[PDB]
Design a protein around this ligand. Structure first.
Ligand SMILES: [Ca+2]
Ligand SMILES: [Ca+2]
Ligand SMILES: [Ca+2]
Ligand SMILES: [Ca+2]
Ligand SMILES: [Ca+2]
Ligand SMILES: [Ca+2]
Ligand SMILES: [Ca+2]
Ligand SMILES: [Ca+2]
Ligand SMILES: [Cl-]
Ligand SMILES: [Cl-]
Ligand SMILES: [Cl-]
Ligand SMILES: [Cl-]
Ligand SMILES: [Hg+2]
Ligand SMILES: [Hg+2]
Ligand SMILES: [Hg+2]
Ligand SMILES: [Hg+2]
Ligand SMILES: [Hg+2]
Ligand SMILES: [Hg+2]
Lengths: 353, 353, 353, 353
């Protein structure tokens, strides 16, 4: 692999509804966004079937739950502008239809929720800078104007809240290194300058918070293995060294915190099967990778059910969505094998790939 | 103190709104519930002023945020029945007015949110058993019939979710010991039998979850000191021994998880000032108690702001509500001194006292 | 129990030889010190049989291994002076016979090894102060003069090294509280003043170091339960609050660090059987007490074999020494049941009892 | 670098005497082993001056303290046989002079102490297998015959005790991977088969035990960065994945456990200065590397003083030994800058280089 490579993305974005039912969003062969949901909140439930949003799109869709429980999805239109669609009431399949946020974007949208209940969306703009736009009142269809945060991006952005409520955004730069930028006051439009985390990455960055507040960032490195770095203080500016884990991976990673608070990472492996690694006790070390049967065709997308069971979605070689999950709520639960969520096939609409 | 004593309760219940603004609920000298809120989500904000719900009540009110962001308050009426009132839209001061849930209750109400988005309320009934009633659909004013879980209670109940999504309820029994009972399947009406945790307690039990999933229960013991016990596995049935911490306390304790994931407990001390203790690193040991200036007249009620800053409310010797908070988002932040939230005075309407 | 009570002591002192074989020292009905050893270093080994040191004594004996591997035992004589006896070569049963250190003592002797290889002995003197005397060259029969550290003691002393090499000594004072005093420079005669740790104790204090350097002190409290306190920094002056563990104990406790680094405490319980409690993960919480079959007549004395297996010695109701041990090297190993080390019977010669 | 490279070794071996004074052993330009020691046990002490052992040698010397406190040094002779020399009494500069152990060896000797007090030496033999030889009685000049453990080695061996008392040996194999082999019963000649840990290494392996018992192995990898792997259970057969840390290193690493129980690693960096990294809390993550001023010409050799202060030795560009150390006993102590231990110059006599 080349330093500028971007490992295969996940094929859906997933959210929990207000009642914790999982719902997945992807792009079909018709170039429209479709979605499907659990009818009840557990991994063994029946799914509703695939439902279409009208409209042709040109990125992977991103979904977040509002602070009033309503899901809202963001995507790029054929006009290269940002559009959004929301549930008009929590836990219902009545949606607004696509509504315009304008702008000109050249990445997938990334959506985060501020600690004051307002959604905020990050994109690469037509000028290759990071731009953002936000709700001006929590869980309301009232949005700010677009604003630039500068930079020169070469990945999709990833955003997360710090423990203190400050959004921090990660993206690869023109030097193929991971860079980041942050709110300097919680839920306020007051941002730092860009700083470099000083490793080449060959995937989008993926970020999660540990038990103790600290953000942890995962990405594929120049040698095609998983690497990661974490915050070591109560600040956005002091971080650990980078560490790599042996094992060549061939997609973006997906991280999740398990029921015991330990982190787990899933990624397509060198053999094109799903691989999983977990922290063997508090703060590491990381297990050898374990492999699930079956060749997969995207990165995994990972989610958690209402009972804490982990569930993983992937594109199969039939171009359809498949999933598997933990059979019990336990860090050492056994797993199901791949099951089909049929009715459509999917395409990788990720803008930066 | 007598084994059957119940240490002084907190004087308000507090919740975070959908936008994380704090809002407090108590009972005034008119025997009505009044409430007050932060106008913006941080501890230094202006407060709106005290607003009254019409209606005479006969318990401490309990509040929870629905899974659609709307606050809902529960209280006993002059008819000894359960009543409830909700925001008709998240983050707004338009409420339903008191609506009846009937029943006959002889404790404060305790409200929990299931992992499938449905509120559930626990009470001591007229027969001294634990009874419960729940939303039949998440965040909807559709409620079940009353159902008994049996037992013989001598405290108000306290409820919490396990990591796996199963509600577990704690209450003192007729032997003055702490007992507990639990869902055996997440968010389902299928419950265990009552089991004893085998220590006398002289307060309501107070329960919180640690970083790693495990529940931890705090209470005052027979010797008037704080004691605590925790789960040691991935089950509701294996727990640690009880430990006590030196220092005589004179109210219920209030627990909170700080920004670093460590637990902190606040309680009125033997000198009638607010005392605080914290875990000095992961899993303990506990610090010596530190004291804030000022004589207080209730237990503390503890909350967290949108930026993670801890805020503590108490009844003053003027019978009014006072508060103090951390000045920064940091485990070692300095604190403000007691400030008044004036306009009404409050009474302790706790049923079991 | 009275605040001034001193819970029953262990009936032997035990050391590991240079080759890790266990060797035990106690006082028989003839008022002489006798000893016995494993012939090979594991808990299942044959023992040599009881061997007598000539001479009548008037305290429990204390043993330490020199920095040259030679065991050395300390005891009070009928003259109330301190005497000592050593192996003339490591791992051999040729001893010096009792040799005089003079002084006038009114406690059991406590021996520690400095971080520069010199043994140092602490006692209560005829004036009730703590006194000490030390080797002037490591592992050599060259000793200092006696020196006082003042204080007023009402227990036997217990000493331990800090991580930084500074000896720290713990003893109960005239107020029945635990007090302590420390070297302010490693392995140097430069000491702090006495400070109080501010809890009544009803046993000698027992001290051990945790994995991370920090000392932890155990003792029985005024309510007859086990209590403990630990250092929270890198200093002798900042400590945690005291915590107690439920369960009435009827001897001194004995602490040990297991193979995984977690602490375990053994003590005679309210039913006069041996009880054990362990830390369930890093830094606690503590397990419920588990009980071994059989009524015992002293505190346990705990040791570790060459393979890390824990072994526990106790006085039986036949006045003879019995022991049991872990069958494998594992924190969750099963245990043997009490076996006899016969040939003599023992008496409790502890001075302060 | 080539996969078969062996990063520059340390230039001395170091031990603590029975009184904890540091003593260093290296090979001078006369091809003899010389040594030097602290006159008193702390990093600021005067050193005695360089003293020669008569005899020409052909490997790096290895030193261990016997279980009776006496230092003993092992080295290869001009006959390619193993020789040894010991202090005739602990803490004295009277030595036996070189005595023969025979054999035919093609690595540096590695010496370990069994949990039953017997030294044991591991070497690569003339046949490229691992061979060993041991004291038959603890701390006695009575040695076994040579015995083979087979294998095909391409590094010097490194040995360490498990928590359970079983010696385990690590060495690079013919595939440039790290392999290992272990006692299956503590301090007994009963060994496992060879197993592979499945990463290429480009240094000797370096092994240390963590607080909680678990061994951790460090080595340079194929990409010239530090990598490490640890045990995850209570067994020699279950280990973590390998992790690498960013930063190109140019010598063997040297690991040490600090006063707080956390690990630290020192290594020459890409700029030829000494680099240090530490675990930022329990179990990681690892800090960025910090650099000390001054170009160095060997790997560091790390030791701990009687007061826990870390001290580091290196070859300077004058071919003499230099050292620096912590000024206080604290994990965050400041450091001295390089000071000379003059009087001889040294050569790298490591056999496998
Ligand atoms: Ca709304
Ligand atoms: Ca805001
Ligand atoms: Ca609703
Ligand atoms: Ca349900
Ligand atoms: Ca000696
Ligand atoms: Ca000294
Ligand atoms: Ca010897
Ligand atoms: Ca042996
Ligand atoms: Cl986000
Ligand atoms: Cl609750
Ligand atoms: Cl000691
Ligand atoms: Cl070794
Ligand atoms: Hg986010
Ligand atoms: Hg940890
Ligand atoms: Hg709850
Ligand atoms: Hg921990
Ligand atoms: Hg000691
Ligand atoms: Hg070793």
């Amino acid at each position: 692999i080349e330093n500028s490579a971007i490992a295969l993305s996940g094929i859906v974005s997933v959210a929990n509804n207000a009642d914790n039912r999982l719902e997945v969003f992807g792009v079909s062969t018709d170039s429209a966004v479709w979605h499907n949901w659990q009818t009840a909140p557990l991994p063994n439930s029946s799914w509703a079937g695939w439902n279409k949003f009208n409209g042709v799109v040109t990125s992977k869709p991103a979904v977040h739950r509002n602070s009033d429980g309503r899901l809202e999805v963001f995507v790029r239109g054929t006009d290269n502008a940002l559009w959004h669609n929301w549930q008009t009431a929590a836990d219902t399949n009545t949606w607004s239809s696509w509504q315009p946020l304008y702008g000109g974007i050249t990445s997938n949208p990334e959506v985060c929720l501020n600690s004051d209940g307002r959604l905020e969306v990050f994109v690469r703009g037509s000028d290759n800078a990071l731009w953002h736009i936000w709700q001006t009142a929590a869980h309301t269809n009232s949005w700010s104007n677009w604003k630039s945060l500068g930079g020169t991006l070469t990945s999709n952005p990833a955003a997360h809240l710090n423990a203190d409520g400050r959004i921090e955004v990660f993206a690869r730069g023109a030097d193929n290194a991971l860079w980041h930028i942050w709110q300097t006051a919680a839920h306020t439009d007051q941002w730092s300058n860009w700083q470099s985390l000083k490793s080449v990455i060959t995937s989008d960055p993926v970020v999660i918070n540990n038990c103790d507040g600290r953000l942890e960032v995962f990405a594929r490195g120049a040698d095609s293995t998983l690497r990661h770095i974490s915050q070591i203080g109560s600040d956005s500016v002091s971080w650990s060294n980078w560490q790599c884990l042996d094992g060549v991976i061939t997609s973006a990673p997906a991280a999740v915190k398990n029921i015991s608070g330990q982190l787990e990472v899933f990624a397509r492996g060198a053999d094109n099967t799903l691989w999983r690694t977990w922290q063997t006790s508090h703060n590491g070390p990381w297990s050898n990778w374990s492999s699930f049967t079956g060749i997969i065709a995207s990165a995994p997308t990972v989610a958690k059910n209402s009972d804490g069971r982990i569930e993983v979605f992937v594109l199969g070689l039939d171009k359809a969505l498949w999933h598997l999950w933990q059979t019990t709520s336990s860090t050492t639960s056994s797993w199901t094998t791949w099951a089909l969520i049929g009715g459509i096939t999917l395409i990788d609409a990720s803008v930066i790939k």
